Design a protein around this motif. Sequence first.
Motif, PDB file in Angstrom:
ATOM      1  N   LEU B  44       0.824  -1.212   0.000  1.00 41.96           N
ATOM      2  CA  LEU B  44       0.000   0.000   0.000  1.00 41.96           C
ATOM      3  C   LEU B  44       0.860   1.265   0.000  1.00 41.96           C
ATOM      4  O   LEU B  44       0.567   2.233  -0.719  1.00 41.96           O
ATOM      5  N   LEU B  45       1.941   1.269   0.780  1.00 42.38           N
ATOM      6  CA  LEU B  45       2.840   2.421   0.773  1.00 42.38           C
ATOM      7  C   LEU B  45       3.450   2.653  -0.606  1.00 42.38           C
ATOM      8  O   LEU B  45       3.534   3.793  -1.074  1.00 42.38           O
ATOM      9  N   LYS B  46       3.890   1.582  -1.265  1.00 40.50           N
ATOM     10  CA  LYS B  46       4.497   1.712  -2.585  1.00 40.50           C
ATOM     11  C   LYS B  46       3.504   2.241  -3.610  1.00 40.50           C
ATOM     12  O   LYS B  46       3.866   3.031  -4.491  1.00 40.50           O
ATOM     13  N   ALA B  47       2.252   1.791  -3.534  1.00 41.90           N
ATOM     14  CA  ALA B  47       1.234   2.318  -4.435  1.00 41.90           C
ATOM     15  C   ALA B  47       1.066   3.818  -4.240  1.00 41.90           C
ATOM     16  O   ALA B  47       1.028   4.587  -5.212  1.00 41.90           O
ATOM     17  N   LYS B  48       1.003   4.257  -2.984  1.00 38.58           N
ATOM     18  CA  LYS B  48       0.873   5.688  -2.729  1.00 38.58           C
ATOM     19  C   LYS B  48       2.073   6.456  -3.263  1.00 38.58           C
ATOM     20  O   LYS B  48       1.930   7.569  -3.778  1.00 38.58           O
ATOM     21  N   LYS B  49       3.264   5.878  -3.152  1.00 41.14           N
ATOM     22  CA  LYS B  49       4.454   6.540  -3.674  1.00 41.14           C
ATOM     23  C   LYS B  49       4.419   6.681  -5.195  1.00 41.14           C
ATOM     24  O   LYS B  49       4.792   7.729  -5.728  1.00 41.14           O
ATOM     25  N   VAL B  50       3.987   5.647  -5.920  1.00 43.54           N
ATOM     26  CA  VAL B  50       4.080   5.702  -7.381  1.00 43.54           C
ATOM     27  C   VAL B  50       2.796   6.199  -8.036  1.00 43.54           C
ATOM     28  O   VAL B  50       2.670   6.154  -9.261  1.00 43.54           O
ATOM     29  N   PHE B  51       1.845   6.670  -7.244  1.00 47.21           N
ATOM     30  CA  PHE B  51       0.601   7.182  -7.803  1.00 47.21           C
ATOM     31  C   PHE B  51       0.879   8.277  -8.837  1.00 47.21           C
ATOM     32  O   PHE B  51       1.732   9.143  -8.606  1.00 47.21           O
ATOM     33  N   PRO B  52       0.177   8.285  -9.982  1.00 45.06           N
ATOM     34  CA  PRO B  52      -0.866   7.364 -10.435  1.00 45.06           C
ATOM     35  C   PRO B  52      -0.403   6.209 -11.318  1.00 45.06           C
ATOM     36  O   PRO B  52      -1.241   5.584 -11.945  1.00 45.06           O
ATOM     37  N   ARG B  53       0.882   5.891 -11.409  1.00 40.13           N
ATOM     38  CA  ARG B  53       1.295   4.751 -12.211  1.00 40.13           C
ATOM     39  C   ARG B  53       0.734   3.466 -11.608  1.00 40.13           C
ATOM     40  O   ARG B  53       0.613   3.360 -10.386  1.00 40.13           O
ATOM     41  N   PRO B  54       0.360   2.492 -12.429  1.00 45.04           N
ATOM     42  CA  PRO B  54      -0.092   1.210 -11.884  1.00 45.04           C
ATOM     43  C   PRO B  54       1.025   0.514 -11.124  1.00 45.04           C
ATOM     44  O   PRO B  54       2.205   0.649 -11.446  1.00 45.04           O
ATOM     45  N   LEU B  55       0.642  -0.239 -10.095  1.00 44.81           N
ATOM     46  CA  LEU B  55       1.643  -0.880  -9.252  1.00 44.81           C
ATOM     47  C   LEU B  55       2.419  -1.959  -9.998  1.00 44.81           C
ATOM     48  O   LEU B  55       3.574  -2.226  -9.663  1.00 44.81           O
ATOM     49  N   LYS B  56       1.820  -2.581 -11.009  1.00 41.95           N
ATOM     50  CA  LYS B  56       2.455  -3.680 -11.719  1.00 41.95           C
ATOM     51  C   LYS B  56       2.451  -3.432 -13.216  1.00 41.95           C
ATOM     52  O   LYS B  56       1.449  -2.985 -13.779  1.00 41.95           O
ATOM     53  N   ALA B  57       3.569  -3.749 -13.856  1.00 40.04           N
ATOM     54  CA  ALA B  57       3.769  -3.521 -15.275  1.00 40.04           C
ATOM     55  C   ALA B  57       2.988  -4.531 -16.112  1.00 40.04           C
ATOM     56  O   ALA B  57       2.529  -5.564 -15.627  1.00 40.04           O
ATOM     57  N   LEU B  58       2.849  -4.213 -17.394  1.00 37.55           N
ATOM     58  CA  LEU B  58       2.077  -5.029 -18.318  1.00 37.55           C
ATOM     59  C   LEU B  58       2.891  -6.217 -18.816  1.00 37.55           C
ATOM     60  O   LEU B  58       4.056  -6.074 -19.188  1.00 37.55           O
ATOM     61  N   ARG B  59       2.256  -7.381 -18.858  1.00 38.05           N
ATOM     62  CA  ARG B  59       2.907  -8.628 -19.214  1.00 38.05           C
ATOM     63  C   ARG B  59       2.113  -9.374 -20.274  1.00 38.05           C
ATOM     64  O   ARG B  59       0.903  -9.178 -20.399  1.00 38.05           O
ATOM     65  N   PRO B  60       2.768 -10.224 -21.056  1.00 38.59           N
ATOM     66  CA  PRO B  60       2.082 -10.960 -22.118  1.00 38.59           C
ATOM     67  C   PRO B  60       1.451 -12.259 -21.631  1.00 38.59           C
ATOM     68  O   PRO B  60       1.657 -12.702 -20.504  1.00 38.59           O
ATOM     69  N   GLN B  61       0.685 -12.872 -22.524  1.00 37.78           N
ATOM     70  CA  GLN B  61       0.079 -14.177 -22.295  1.00 37.78           C
ATOM     71  C   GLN B  61       0.872 -15.246 -23.038  1.00 37.78           C
ATOM     72  O   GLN B  61       1.183 -15.081 -24.217  1.00 37.78           O
ATOM     73  N   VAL B  62       1.202 -16.341 -22.351  1.00 36.05           N
ATOM     74  CA  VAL B  62       1.986 -17.423 -22.934  1.00 36.05           C
ATOM     75  C   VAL B  62       1.272 -18.749 -22.697  1.00 36.05           C
ATOM     76  O   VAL B  62       0.316 -18.837 -21.932  1.00 36.05           O
ATOM     77  N   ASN B  63       1.746 -19.785 -23.382  1.00 38.33           N
ATOM     78  CA  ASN B  63       1.256 -21.148 -23.219  1.00 38.33           C
ATOM     79  C   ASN B  63       2.199 -21.937 -22.323  1.00 38.33           C
ATOM     80  O   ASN B  63       3.416 -21.776 -22.400  1.00 38.33           O
TER      81      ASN B  63
END
Lengths: 144, 205
Positions: B44-63
Amino acid sequence: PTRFKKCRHQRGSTFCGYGRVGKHRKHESGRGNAGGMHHHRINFDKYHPGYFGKLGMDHYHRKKNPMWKPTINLNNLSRLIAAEEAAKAAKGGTLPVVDLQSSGYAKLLGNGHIQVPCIVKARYVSKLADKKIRKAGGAVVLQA
Amino acid sequence: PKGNNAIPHVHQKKHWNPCSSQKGNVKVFLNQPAQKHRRRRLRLLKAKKVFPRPLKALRPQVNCPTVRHNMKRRLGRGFSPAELKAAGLNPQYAATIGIRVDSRRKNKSEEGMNVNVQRLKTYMSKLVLFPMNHKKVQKGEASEEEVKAATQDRSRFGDAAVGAVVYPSAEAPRAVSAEEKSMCVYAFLKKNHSAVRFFGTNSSR
RNA sequence: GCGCGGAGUCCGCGCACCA
RNA sequence: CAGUGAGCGGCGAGCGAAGAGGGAACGAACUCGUUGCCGAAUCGGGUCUUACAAGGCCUUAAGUUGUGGCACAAAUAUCAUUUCGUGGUUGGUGCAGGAGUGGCGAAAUUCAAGCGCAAAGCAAACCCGUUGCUGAAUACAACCCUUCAUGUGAGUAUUGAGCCAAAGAAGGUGUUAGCCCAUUGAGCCAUAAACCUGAGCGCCUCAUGAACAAGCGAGUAGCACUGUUUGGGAAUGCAGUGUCAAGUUGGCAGGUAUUUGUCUGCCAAAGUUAAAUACAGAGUAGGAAGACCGAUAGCGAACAAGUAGCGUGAGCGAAAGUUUGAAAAGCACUUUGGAAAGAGAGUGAAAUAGAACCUGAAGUCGUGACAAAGACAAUGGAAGUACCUCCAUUUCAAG
RNA sequence: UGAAAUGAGCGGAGUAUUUGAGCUGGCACGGGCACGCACUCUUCUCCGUGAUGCUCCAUGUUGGCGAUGGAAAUGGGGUGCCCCCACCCGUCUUGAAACACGGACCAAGGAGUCAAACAGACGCGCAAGGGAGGAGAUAUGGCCAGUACUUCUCUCGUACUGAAAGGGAGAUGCAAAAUGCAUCUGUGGUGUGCACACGUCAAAUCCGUUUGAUUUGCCCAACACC
RNA sequence: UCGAACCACCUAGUAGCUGGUUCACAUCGAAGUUUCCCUCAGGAUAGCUGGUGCUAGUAGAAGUAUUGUGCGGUAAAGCGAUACUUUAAAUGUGCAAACAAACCGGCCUUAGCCAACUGCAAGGCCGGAAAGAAAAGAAUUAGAGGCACCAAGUGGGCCUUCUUCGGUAAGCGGAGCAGGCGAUGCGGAAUGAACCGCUUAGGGAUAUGUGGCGUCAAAACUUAUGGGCUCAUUCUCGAUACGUAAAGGGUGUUGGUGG
RNA sequence: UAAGGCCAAUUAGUGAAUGCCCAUUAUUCCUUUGGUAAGGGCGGAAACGGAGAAAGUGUAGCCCUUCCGAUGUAGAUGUGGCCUGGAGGUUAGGACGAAGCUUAUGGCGUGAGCCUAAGAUGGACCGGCCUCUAGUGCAGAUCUUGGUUGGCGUAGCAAAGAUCUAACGGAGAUAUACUCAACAUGCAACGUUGGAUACUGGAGCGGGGAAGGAUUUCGUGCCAACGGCACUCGUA
RNA sequence: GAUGCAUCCAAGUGGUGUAUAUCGCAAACUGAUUUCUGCCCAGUGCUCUGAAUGUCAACGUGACGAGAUUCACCGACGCG
RNA sequence: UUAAUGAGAUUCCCUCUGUCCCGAGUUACUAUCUAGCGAAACGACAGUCAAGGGAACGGACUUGAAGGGCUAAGCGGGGAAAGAAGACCCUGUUGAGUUUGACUCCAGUCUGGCUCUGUGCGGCGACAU
RNA sequence: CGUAAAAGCUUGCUUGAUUAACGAUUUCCAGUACGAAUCGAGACUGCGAAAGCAAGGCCAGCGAUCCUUUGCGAUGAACAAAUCAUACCAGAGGUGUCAGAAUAAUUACCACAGGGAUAACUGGCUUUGGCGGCCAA
RNA sequence: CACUGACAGGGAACGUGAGCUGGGUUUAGACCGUCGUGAGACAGGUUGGUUUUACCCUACUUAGCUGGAAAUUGCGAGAA
RNA sequence: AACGUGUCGCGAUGGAUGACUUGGCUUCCUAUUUCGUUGAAGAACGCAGUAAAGUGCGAUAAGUGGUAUCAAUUGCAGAUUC
Ligand SMILES: [K+]
Ligand SMILES: [Mg+2]
Ligand SMILES: [Mg+2]
Ligand SMILES: [Mg+2]
Ligand SMILES: [Mg+2]
Ligand SMILES: [Mg+2]
Ligand SMILES: [Mg+2]
Ligand SMILES: [Mg+2]
Ligand SMILES: [Mg+2]
Ligand SMILES: [Mg+2]
Ligand SMILES: [Mg+2]
Ligand SMILES: [Mg+2]
Ligand SMILES: [Mg+2]
Ligand SMILES: [Mg+2]
Ligand SMILES: [Mg+2]
Ligand SMILES: [Mg+2]
Ligand SMILES: [Mg+2]
Ligand SMILES: [Mg+2]
Ligand SMILES: [Mg+2]
Ligand SMILES: [Mg+2]
Ligand SMILES: [Mg+2]
Ligand SMILES: [Mg+2]
Ligand SMILES: [Mg+2]
Ligand SMILES: [Mg+2]
Ligand SMILES: [Mg+2]
Ligand SMILES: [Mg+2]
Ligand SMILES: [Mg+2]
Ligand SMILES: [Mg+2]
Ligand SMILES: [Mg+2]
Ligand SMILES: [Mg+2]
Ligand SMILES: [Mg+2]
Ligand SMILES: [Mg+2]
Ligand SMILES: [Mg+2]
Ligand SMILES: [Mg+2]
Ligand SMILES: [Mg+2]
Ligand SMILES: [Mg+2]
Ligand SMILES: [Mg+2]
Ligand SMILES: [Mg+2]
Ligand SMILES: [Mg+2]
Ligand SMILES: [Mg+2]
Ligand SMILES: [Mg+2]
Ligand SMILES: [Mg+2]
Ligand code: NA
Ligand code: NA
């Protein structure tokens, strides 16, 4: 719980159920599975036949994922069809389609009498299962 | 006397128990709830620090690999440069707007590439890029209204604006065809298996 | 068990040894 | 996954992992050498700019037996400049707000009844009840009766009325306290740097973003012998000596040795790198707890404890709660005694609370009264009797 | 001590009843009947009280002692005495009172525990399915190291067998195909076998029904042979 | 401190060996034997014991008789040598004696036997009979059959009766059958683990067992209105089994046979 | 003229089954406990001698009636069986006296134990019941630690020869109830000075040093402990 | 006869008899003087000589095989 | 075999004597009694005998004989008296010291090969030729 | 023990002393194994005119795991070929302490845990050797 | 060998070690013979080699004090 | 008699039990959290008006300077923002 144990009942009986003549000594038979061929031979042979020796070929690096192959029988297929399609199903009409590899099965076996006809998609099938389901009015489609 | 019991293999013959002469070799989990609380607090602290960037980066879908997990899907490490080029993106610039890049992964089939290109396009259509200088806005950057109405996606996987992994659709009911009633598939399957199995011996002779 | 001699058999010599 | 239908093992006792799957963490990535194009553009030292500036000027001092720049799979290529901007992680001068840290900072009874015995009760779920009602302590004090006396520490206790609570949450105070005291918020004030804030906000200097054809790490890898280690089995990793390559048409890995063709993954022999993990006899500054121990327990150590004491030495290592009382009010004075003490007197609720002083058991011993009693060891069982009994229970008149 | 006195014994009614002994009139018993089987003396007979009472306890006569006390009485406790009885505890051992070992007194301390794998019995939940673990999410930001919620995975099981390459289990009828054909409300068969249904038999019963045995049908669980 | 010093640590080293192991009552209650083991002061294994049940409560019962029908070579008997054996007991031991069984006649099936089947073998179906086992000494039962699961102690024994093998003999060693003690007191034999009687919840009354009735010591307060026999002088007449004296003599006394 | 040994009787040729004594046995009566236990009652009849009456494994047993068994080492099992420290609930007690301690304090229970009385004891905490939990019960281990104890006023305090006397000092005396001149009613022991008598015997209980010790050295006081007897004295 | 003999040490340009040099140093037995000290080399020890091929190890050499291999030849002390 | 030497082992003779026949008398310090001081070891409970039986050698049991209580000095019959988990002997799948022609090994010593390792001259071979 | 036109003796022909689908059983016995033995079904045979008899010599004469080796007809996990290794089945090489460790002495310099389960001394039982008596001789 | 009337045999935990003595036997030192490769052995010889405690109970020997006939009581009365 | 034995009342010796607890043990968390040649850790000697140990401190020695507080310290002495 300690209050239910046999020690509570044995307070005052000096020997605690181990006898006066032969006592409660440390290791009167050896430790562990010792003596399996000498002085515990009868117990080993009567209760665990087959324990000693070698058998068969080796297989050095076993991986279970490439051997994964669960099976399901013909008279159990209704476990995979929802109750609304099962009653509507009828031979000569429209039938539910069952995908085995999505429900966690690889092979279809042919034990018993099929109850709801359907179309089954499987990686493997036995010959009797194929014959039986065709006679009942369904089909098998091979998949990968 | 021993009766009919299983033959035991309990494996406790090293100095694992701590006592007057041994340090022991033991691991307990008595700090488990406190560590759970601490991890959530840090998130929660990290989210407040990086606001408004999303907490987790975008990742692809794999098999998933192997014949046991062939039918499953999950999130991989990062997007391949081929997918990024199909989406029109410099990898080095994509690293700065919250997209993960993986240069090791190859694309051996078209459908796996198409899924991830669609993920990238859906993300790019919803990005709100803030201007470097509040004075001057250059090219495709947010105005001040969006900077006012900016929010943080705190989802556990960072899939708020691309969604979860998709799966192949389920076949609808249908009728059994004439050839399906006509002939079995068991013989065909056995023939293919035997062809591969006895290849080599059938060809040397 | 392996090599040399000397009358598969025997005789010596020097070596080998996980039911 | 897995105490494994792997595997190792006088194939005995025993031993024993890996890939995949759900997750934690994750802004995670970069630097040399080599190849090509440049070639001192580099470093140190003086000196001057508010400055031992990533800045100017000067320096043979180091360095061509090579410092440094540009490009190379997330790439499209070398240069070419002046435009607009950017950099608080170039250096020099300043200026804020926050977090943190330290101090300050809350309510409501000492309310009414008095002393051995009513400052105690009864009225049978609730309501009657803000109402009624009432004394078996005319006390007790050691064989029994009379006379004189003496005997209750501090109300956080009972009872009756009443207040505070966004505070009922523990601690202190002479007995058991929401309202006797402390503590607890809201809020206020003060700060060297560092940390956070349109990568906070100005100046000077200093940097600089965008349009405008070859190659890739050698006593290395491998192989032979020996030794060791591993689940690793015609050899999992490593070490010594001998021997010692190839040239991306190449090399390494694909868990049974060899030779020969395919196929798949990857590119060793140079370097840096946060978080998620350990703290199994550490330490600094702070905090929070416990179905734990309760002075022969719990650390050896609740105490001037690693102390006193022991050993030539390496080392070994205790006992011991100071718990009198609410308060020293810690026994003035008289009398006997050389003194220690004794007998009186006094303080205190209490001195059988008088200083190592709460309680003060068992075992052992003194003294007074009583019961008897031969040598039958003593103790013990059963059944009576003599004498006693601070014990219990039942009966006293029509019963 | 009559708070249901079951009595040949307490009550009502009369004088007779019927037990034997002597003596009397077809078959049996023996080579006649000692008196087997069938039709005067000697004694008392018939009748009666259910429990609207499930259980427990409460009922005579005559004296002594006890009239409120340093009372009487019963029980308990203490000490002595008499008659009788009676080898020292724990332990090893075939055998201890032992000339077999340990044993001066008292206080406080002092010995089947915790963990992990498997099994059986018993309690609880769900069931062809059961259940996590690790972790997350938000009520939640001394209470709060608890409680409440969760995916998609993993694990045990629903199928076994072969050293392995591998293969993989219904019934009935027709039939004989080295993958036959047709139906799908169904124990593969036989013997033994709860309960229920249909009849029978015997015993008791204010007598409408019980208590047992047994035939037939289907046989649940289970065992035996196929 | 020396046939390998001292100090600390690995170390609470291991011990089939010695010592210890803390409350009450209740329901039940053993074994010292089998097989295997570098196995003899130890284990595992079966038996004996406890707990839990399952199953249609008289069933597939019996440490015992009777009747029918089988097995036997010991005692006794006899004659190799100078005990081997024709004969042959007592005490034993196997089987049967009407309800899943057996008896009398439909019929079905078999790629069983036979030259063949209307015979034989086997498995079934349909019927009959049934003193449900008479009479002749002609059973009895404190007579409910079967089937599992989990686990303890024990694996040093000893005494006696009747058989016995070794040994000169032994309170000696080794065996067979049964009963005991061990694990047990109580009443008797003066005393005694094992003898005799009897086997045990806490108490009265009556009557007995073994053993007793002069005193010790309950009982003939030294019973009888019964008969015989016996005299014994330094361990000494004798007098409760199991249990601790011979040949030969005797006119001591009491009787019996034949001469 | 057995109280011996063999035989035989039961009150004796009278006329009809048992002379007498003693068990944890037998028969029978009362009570307990347990069963492979066996029956019955439990819709409050009505009225008004006493009370009660629970559909129940196990209790102060739901209540009656009936029948049979009861010893036991090693060992098994049961128990609305007993007891100790702490937790969750519930219900109470206490300065008009909690815990702990004491007992010719009785009562209850087959028992483990529970409860009341008195303290001429104590001075602040704590009991019952249902669940939960454990470092949960002692007579003995040549057991551990603390404290007692008979032997016992005992064994002994015996090498290095030894002291005596007066005066002074000191609380350490010449210390008395009647009666009594003094003895027969205050003993024993000490420091200093003088005198006497002995010992060491120059390889010395003489005078100086090293090692080791570290104030033991000096003066004035003091005499609790220590100087295995004593002290007015001391390396205390 | 020092390029030694005996010998310490984990090891080195390390140490001791050795500051020595056969009238010396190191290792054994017997035990003053006097008078003597016989026979045995089979055994076990110790010691000395060769057969270059009696026997053997690694290395080395040749052949067979696609190769891992296989065969042959050589081979010192010692033993005999 | 040996003179001299010996706190070495043995036999005889002279001298001498309480070693003995056979004991007696005396001293000093104890013991003994007193003043002062003051332990230990050991300690199930205890403590008169005869016979009997008994784990076959009793203080306690059976049947008999004795036995009033409390004390001082001695004494060595009994208490199978105290002293130490029998140093003899056996057992255990318990040790240690020592030996060897016991099983399995390691240092040391010797021997071969490769290596350290260079420059010329001859000789004998073998493989090509 | 058994056996007389044989089970002994002579003689003729032979190889049933082979193979035998994991059939059942006895002895030991835990109702385990091993060794030995009994009753069988199938193949291929021998002898005999035939019925028949014969899978050794009736009854003692023998042996686990692992390893080695021979006979007979799937694997080496990315594919393929030829070698090599391994696997299922049946035998052979051996454990005589024979239900199966790979094993020399000494201690008087000695040690520990125990044993009266066990010797050396008294005592007990029994015999010994002592020792002369009593009838007859 | 000598004396004498005579120089009998036995038991008492093979009487008697907190009564003595310690020659033998039975530790460690050492020598010889035989045996053993050897460390060592010998029911063969030889020499040298710590003998502890009573003050307790009883028994025995002597030495003192003192109750008592219901053998301590009842008043319970018995005269050689 | 005496010595001894037994019971009850009251005293001594002895230090158990109960109640008490500024100590121990165990678990969890938060940080501009990690010594020394610029001389550490350890070791020694000293310092108060009165001072043995212990605590604090170093010849500036039971403490100097600064900030904040606001009237003590205390066995005895001595002396408000100082
Ligand atoms: K004395
Ligand atoms: Mg018992
Ligand atoms: Mg045992
Ligand atoms: Mg035993
Ligand atoms: Mg194999
Ligand atoms: Mg068993
Ligand atoms: Mg330790
Ligand atoms: Mg460069
Ligand atoms: Mg490279
Ligand atoms: Mg290399
Ligand atoms: Mg290893
Ligand atoms: Mg690194
Ligand atoms: Mg402590
Ligand atoms: Mg006190
Ligand atoms: Mg005993
Ligand atoms: Mg299964
Ligand atoms: Mg010494
Ligand atoms: Mg232990
Ligand atoms: Mg130990
Ligand atoms: Mg024991
Ligand atoms: Mg019984
Ligand atoms: Mg024993
Ligand atoms: Mg026994
Ligand atoms: Mg008996
Ligand atoms: Mg009498
Ligand atoms: Mg009953
Ligand atoms: Mg019983
Ligand atoms: Mg305990
Ligand atoms: Mg105790
Ligand atoms: Mg003296
Ligand atoms: Mg003297
Ligand atoms: Mg002189
Ligand atoms: Mg003194
Ligand atoms: Mg004596
Ligand atoms: Mg004496
Ligand atoms: Mg045949
Ligand atoms: Mg092998
Ligand atoms: Mg014996
Ligand atoms: Mg205490
Ligand atoms: Mg560090
Ligand atoms: Mg000081
Ligand atoms: Mg200075
Ligand atoms: Na506790
Ligand atoms: Na010799």
